[PDB]
Design a protein around this ligand. Structure first.
Ligand SMILES: CC1=N[C@H](C(=O)O)CCN1
Length: 257
């Protein structure tokens, strides 16, 4: 049942995927059509594997690995960036979506916040970030106390909290912040990208550890997409660099480094 997971999905007609609704990584249309770069790549590979559709579930990032391990979804296709800790819990594909981290800030950046350390250093500064996300962990690792790292469910709420003064900075990947701010039409909000001292991350699709045969099959198709140039045709309209993903590997991103 673990080694024949692909057969099960093919006979099912669909894979269940976990997403967060954070353009341009993931997005949901009014009609329910899931798109964004991660679901678009995943939908194309699954189709090539003979799985006709993807069925997307929205959750906050902290719920994704748990639900995957619990067998609730078949893959996480959400821009869930690779990290040693995550790599130990799931079977990742090779890299797909790469991005740096950004801040959304008050115009003029009055608190002079340019790094996660800057936030840790100012006891007034509160940062908003998705729960269980890389930004939240980077804030905590820089020494921002738990009570100044504020969980934010989604981008529109993060911007509203920033505008309202409930947080001083909201942090997401560069492409996500730029997309959100450009749609907001708020002259009193300002983007700093990339965050100084922050790592650049890449994601991949994540599978249950026991579903390694499905991960392999997914990876065979991903490699062919990369080789043909079809990979770039899918992700680059969303703002991603195919070169960046193709310059690295799962083992390098997952290494103790
Ligand atoms: C695409 C994205 N990845 C982060 C992560 O993998 O934790 C959370 C904020 N947005």
């Amino acid at each position: 049942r673990d080694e024949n997971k692909l057969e099960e999905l093919k006979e099912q007609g669909f894979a269940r995927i976990a997403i967060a609704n954070e353009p341009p990584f993931t997005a949901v249309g009014a009609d329910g059509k899931v798109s964004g770069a991660a679901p678009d790549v995943a939908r194309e590979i699954f189709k090539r594997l003979g799985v006709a559709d993807v069925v997307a579930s929205i959750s906050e990032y902290g719920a994704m690995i748990p639900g995957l391990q619990a067998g609730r979804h078949d893959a996480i296709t959400a821009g869930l960036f690779m990290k040693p800790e995550r790599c130990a819990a799931v079977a990742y594909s090779q890299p797909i979506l790469c991005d740096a981290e950004a801040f959304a800030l008050k115009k003029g950046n009055p608190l002079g916040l340019k790094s996660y350390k800057d936030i840790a250093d100012n006891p007034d500064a509160k940062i908003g970030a998705p729960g269980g996300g890389t930004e939240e962990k980077l804030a905590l690792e820089a020494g921002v106390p738990r009570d100044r790292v504020i969980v934010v469910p989604d981008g529109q709420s993060g911007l509203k909290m920033l505008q309202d003064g409930r947080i001083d900075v909201y942090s997401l990947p560069v492409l996500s912040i730029n997309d959100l701010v450009s749609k907001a039409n708020d002259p009193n909000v300002e983007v700093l990208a990339p965050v100084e001292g922050a790592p650049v991350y890449c994601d991949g699709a994540a599978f249950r550890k026991g579903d390694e045969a499905l991960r392999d099959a997914f990876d065979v198709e991903l490699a062919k997409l990369k080789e043909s140039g079809e990979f770039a045709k899918i992700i680059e309209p969303y703002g991603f660099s195919a070169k960046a993903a193709m310059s690295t590997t799962r083992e390098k991103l997952c290494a103790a480094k």
